[PDB]
Amino acid sequence: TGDLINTVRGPIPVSEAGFTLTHEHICGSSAGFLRAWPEFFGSRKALAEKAVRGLRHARAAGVQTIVDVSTFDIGRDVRLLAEVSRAADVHIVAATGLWFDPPLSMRMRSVEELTQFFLREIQHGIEDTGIRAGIIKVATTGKATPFQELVLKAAARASLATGVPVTTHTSASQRDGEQQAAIFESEGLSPSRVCIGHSDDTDDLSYLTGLAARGYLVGLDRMPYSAIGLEGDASALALFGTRSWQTRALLIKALIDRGYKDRILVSHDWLFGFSLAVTNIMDVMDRINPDGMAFVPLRVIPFLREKGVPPETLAGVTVANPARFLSPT
Amino acid sequence: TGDLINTVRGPIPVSEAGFTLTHEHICGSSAGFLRAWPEFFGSRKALAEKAVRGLRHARAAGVQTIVDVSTFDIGRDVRLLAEVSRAADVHIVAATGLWFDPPLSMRMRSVEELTQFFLREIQHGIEDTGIRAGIIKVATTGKATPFQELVLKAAARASLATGVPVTTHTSASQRDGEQQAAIFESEGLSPSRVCIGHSDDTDDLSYLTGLAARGYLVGLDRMPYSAIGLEGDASALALFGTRSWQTRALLIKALIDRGYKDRILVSHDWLFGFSLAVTNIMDVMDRINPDGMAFVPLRVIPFLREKGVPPETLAGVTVANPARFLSPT
Ligand SMILES: [Co+2]
Ligand SMILES: [Co+2]
Ligand SMILES: [Fe+2]
Ligand SMILES: [Fe+2]
């Protein structure tokens, strides 16, 4: 009680976050895209409605909070987030940082400047809204680019200054987490303030246990993603992989079995709109996982219980871990 | 009389465009950047004020219209343009198209989709404003990327459908114009609807005359840009070049001397804010060219007259050529 986290509708007690999905999206897009070309999504109204329906479904399944890790370059639209959050009655935590699609205007900035931008979004508010970011999202896709190194350093600096956690995108097969950790540690950031994302994209437990042993959160955040049965579709295969949801889920058990229950964060990396991919992908995704953001509570959690994970352990993963991670520290 | 062109404040008679700068920017930025981080520019208010001052200065020097060729990916802000246009009493023509910094959400689109986006901006309006684009801006930086080819084709298609002209960014030293022309012609676009930009960045008149002979407009649009005296500054050298304004200006005479007066368009490619470059560049630019967008009327035109170009020829370049180019055809 009494620690607070910022959401798109304002501050909430940490204890109110409850069952929380720590890596999600309302819309995966680009800065200004939804504004310039809402028809891409049928309409802004249609997108919002679809999002409210999905969130209501998640809520019925027990989800109380989502962390929307859409950055400026993922086309994050805080007004949209606030609208859908209110209508679905689900908390949404907004993000700052930068993903792997930064425009030149960001790419040309110094580490000091980036830090100031991240700080603005956390401390003051996003755009002209007063809506403050509750998390910092950063990314590599293999070995960090020089700009990416700066971005990670700025993220560490903003976090140390505000207590807001850092969360990442990785090319998990390339073990990006090791480099990301090295950079964060070089800045003095505690591993406990950091989640190494898309970790379920790999079955290399040496890599994963290695991070966990050091105190990192391991983000198992792509639970619904599989191209199994549609390798006909090349975009889907590259995007979704050939591993099943069960294989991904088994990683959660694997880590618990290895003593790392307190270090796990679980999510879908789902969305309700998606312009970051060729046009048909959203439909394909909807066909594969109609449960959307209810998939983890509906399918993953019962799978785990059936494999013998205790309910209290599962509560700790879905409730306690997100609460510790989010609470500014 | 009676042909109309769209501006940020609405429709105007073509005959009212008058002395027109066909390649300009209020702000060279990125989509959503000015919204997310106005402090980068001191403030939105400060940027607008600086722009009004520069435009008023241009207006006093005789400029009546500018074409702001900032695309979605140049962070074009139509509301800003409209605000400054009204306050400075200078017409501004807005653009659609895409520059060389497109985000993934654009990169992932088909030629058909891009065409629909360009058409939306021309026919319906930009974002939710009702402000319609009067031009299409496209870009290559050397050999066209595959996406760039699609963008050029969509631009040709939108132009044929609406009559709005197409204007380009080139790496002039690499002779991009030849390839851009080939693609436009493959789509059936008339060369008269096309301006091949940044053509003053090269002294290869074989290249330039070649375009002109085919009926292309040659955009001599970087008149004030030189790093002479500041090769100490590496960013400035790469950006500005080592050729003087006089050398650039001589190209205008060169083309007139070769029979191509009707094929020339002249501009500054100036701006009042600039986040697309490292932070100090705007200041450096202001120091070199305090006249801003008044530089062409103040310095270039008198230089030309002094080298014997007749006033009526100069009027034709600065008034008649832009009018023919802009008038939807
Ligand atoms: Co990601
Ligand atoms: Co250019
Ligand atoms: Fe994501
Ligand atoms: Fe330009």
The backbone torsions φ and ψ at residue A328, rounded to the nearest 5 degrees and listed phi first, read: -60, 130
> Which helix (H) or strand (E) element contains residue B202?
none
CA distance B128 to chain A (A): 8
Where do we find the tokens 């170009």? B309
Q: How far apart are CA A286 and CA A183, in angstroms?
A: 37
Q: Which residues of B111-120 are buried (b: 16+ CB within 10 A; e: fewer)?
A: eebbbbbbbb
* Unique residue bearing structure tokens 């870009």: B139
Task: Name A67's bridge partners.
Answer: A93
Q: Which residue has the tokens 């992932």?
A: B108
Q: Hey, how many other C-beta atoms are within 10 angstroms of the C-beta on A229?
A: 9
**Do B103 and A127 lie within an 8 Å CB cutoff?**
no
CA neighbor of B99 nearest in space, from B17, B168, B53, B34: B168
Q: Tell me how far apart the 2 most distant CA atoms of chain B are, in Å.
A: 52
CB atoms within 10 A of CB B124: 12
Asked if A105 and B99 count as a contact pair (C-beta separation under 8 A), the reply is: no
- Does the beta carbon of B122 lie under 8 angstroms from any beta carbon of chain A? no
Using DSSP bridges, classify how beta strands B194-196 and B166-169 pair: parallel, antiparallel or unpaired: parallel
Nearest CA to A113 out of B39, B320, B96 is that of: B39
Phi, psi of A90 (to 5 degrees): -130, 130
| Phi, psi of B159, rounded to the nearest 5 degrees | -65, -45
DSSP letters along A298-319, please?
Answer: IIIHHHHHHTT--HHHHHIIII
> Could you give the C-alpha distances from A306 to A86, A314, B243, B275, in angstroms and in order?
35, 12, 74, 55
Query: Which residues 6+ apart lie within 8 Å of A42 measured at CB?
Result: none
Cα separation values, B106 from A279, B74, B109, B148, Å: 11, 13, 5, 11
- Residue B166 DSSP class: E
Alpha carbon distance A66, A56 (integer Å): 12
> Measured between CB atoms, which of A104, A105, A275 is closest to B105?
A275
Cβ(A25)–Cβ(A69) under 8 Å?
A: yes
What is the CA(B40)–ligand 4 centre distance, in A? 20
Enumerate the residues of chain B whose CB falls inside 8 A of the CB of residue A40.
113
- DSSP, residue by residue, B66-90: EEE---GGGT--HHHHHHHHHHHT-
Closest residue on chain B to A277 (Cα)? B108
Per-residue CA distances from A273 to A28, A50, A75, A111, B253 (Å)? 6, 9, 11, 32, 53
- What is the rounded distance in angstroms from the CA atom of residue B256 to the CA atom of residue B17? 23
Distances (CA, A) of A121 to A217, A222, B218: 23, 26, 44
- Alpha-carbon dihedral angle through residues A99, A104, A107, A110, given to the nearest 10 degrees: -130
Residues 6+ apart with CB under 8 A from A237: A227, A230, A231
Q: How many CB pairs under 8 A join A and B?
A: 89
CA distance, residue B39 to nearest chain A CA (Å): 9
Tally the domains of chain B: 1
Do B27 and B274 contact (CB within 8 A), yes or no? yes
Nearest to residue B63, comparing CAs of B291, B324, B308, B303? B291
Distance, CA of A153 to CA of A142 (rounded, Å): 17
For residue A79, report the phi and psi dihedrals to the nearest 5 degrees: -65, -40
The experimental technique used to determine this model is X-ray
CATH number of domain containing A88: 3.20.20.140
Residue type, A154: A
What is the CA(A25)–ligand 3 centre distance, in A? Answer: 6
Number of residues written out for chain A: 329
- Cβ-defined contacts of B299-303 (< 8 Å, 24+): B299/B245, B300/B223, B300/B245, B300/B249, B300/B252, B300/B266, B303/B246, B303/B249
> Distance, CA B198 to ligand 2 centroid (Å)?
7
Q: From the CA of A240, how many Å to the nearest CA of chain B?
A: 17
CB B275 within 8 A of CB B30: yes
* HEC secondary structure over B106-160: HHCCCHHHHHHHHHHHHHHCCCCCCCCCCEEEEECCCCCCHHHHHHHHHHHHHHH
Q: Could you tell me how far CA B249 lies from the centroid of its own chain?
A: 17
Residues 6+ apart with CB under 8 A from B4: B11, B12, B13, B14, B328
Strands (E), B239-291: 264-266, 273-274
Q: Residue B249 half-sphere exposure, CB side, CA atoms within 13 Å?
A: 22
The encoded tokens of residue A309 equal 């994970």
Neighbours of A128 (CB within 10 A): 11
CA neighbours within 13 Å on the CB side: how many for B69? 28
Please give the resolution of this entry in Å, rounded to 1 decimal.
2.0
- DSSP letter assigned to residue B242: S
Q: Which of B327, B189, B208, B326 is nearest to B259 (CA)?
A: B208
| Closest chain B residue to the Cα of A127, Cα to Cα | B36
Report the alpha-carbon distance of residue A289 to residue A204 in Å, rounded.
25
How far is the C-alpha of B25 from the C-alpha of B68, rounded, in Å?
Answer: 5
Cβ pair B253, B304 in contact under 8 A = yes
* Token pair recorded at residue A218: 């391991």
Q: Which residues contact B66 (CB under 8 A, 6 or more apart)?
A: B20, B21, B24, B55, B58, B90, B91, B92, B93, B293
Query: Is residue B27 less than 8 Å (CB to CB) from chain A?
Result: no
Q: Which two tokens stand for residue B139?
A: 């870009």
Residue A267: which of A325, A324, A225 has the closest Cα?
A225
φ, ψ for residue B17, nearest 5 deg: -65, -40
Distance CA A239, CA A222 (A): 11
**Contact criterion met (CB below 8 Å) for B45 and B90:** no
Two tokens at B58? Answer: 């241009």
Q: Using only the alpha carbons of chain A, give its radius of gyration.
A: 18
Rounded CA-CA distance A24/A268 in Å is: 6
The 10 Å CB-count burial string (b at 16+, else e) for B60-96 is ebebbbbbbbbbbbbbbbbebbbbbbeebebbbbbbb
- Residue A12, φ and ψ in degrees, nearest 5: -135, 150
| Angle subtended by helix axes A44-60 and A78-88, to nearest 10 | 40
Q: Could you tell me what percentage of chain A is helix, strand and coil, using 3-state DSSP and rounding each to the nearest 5?
A: 50, 15, 35
Task: Give the C-alpha separation, A129 to A127, whole Å.
Answer: 6
Per-chain residues with Cβ under 5 A from ion ligand 4: B 269
- Would you state the structure tokens that stand for residue B265, as one six-digit string? 């368009």
Whether A253 contacts A309, CB under 8 Å: yes
Alpha helices in B163-221 (DSSP H): 176-186, 205-213
Backbone Cα Rg of chain B: 18
Q: Which domain holds residue B90?
A: 1-329
Is residue A23 within 8 A of residue A267, CB to CB? The reply is: yes
* Distance (Å) of CA A189 to CA A3, A164, A180, B315: 21, 11, 11, 64
Tokens matching residue B195: 């301006």
HSE (CB half, 13 Å, CA atoms) of B325? 33
- The string of DSSP codes covering A124-147 is I-STTS-PPPSEEEEE-SSSPPHH
Closest to B326 (Cα-Cα) out of B93, B74, B58, B115 = B93
> How many CA atoms within 13 Å lie on the side-chain side of A259?
7
| β-pair type (B4-7, B10-13) | antiparallel
Q: Of B271, B272, B265, B270, nearest to B168 (Cα)? A: B265
Cα(B126)–Cα(B23) distance, integer angstroms: 19
Q: Which long-range contacts (CB under 8 A, 24 or more apart) does A189-192 make?
A: A189/A156, A189/A159, A189/A160, A190/A215, A191/A215, A191/A216, A192/A216, A192/A217, A192/A324, A192/A329
Sheet containing B65-68: order of strands: B20-24, B65-68, B91-93
Number of other residues whose CB lies within 10 A of the CB of residue B259: 11
Q: What's the one-letter identity of residue A53?
A: R
Distance CA B328, CA B212 (A): 20
CA distance, residue A103 to nearest chain B CA (Å): 6
- For residue A144 the two structure tokens come to 């960090």
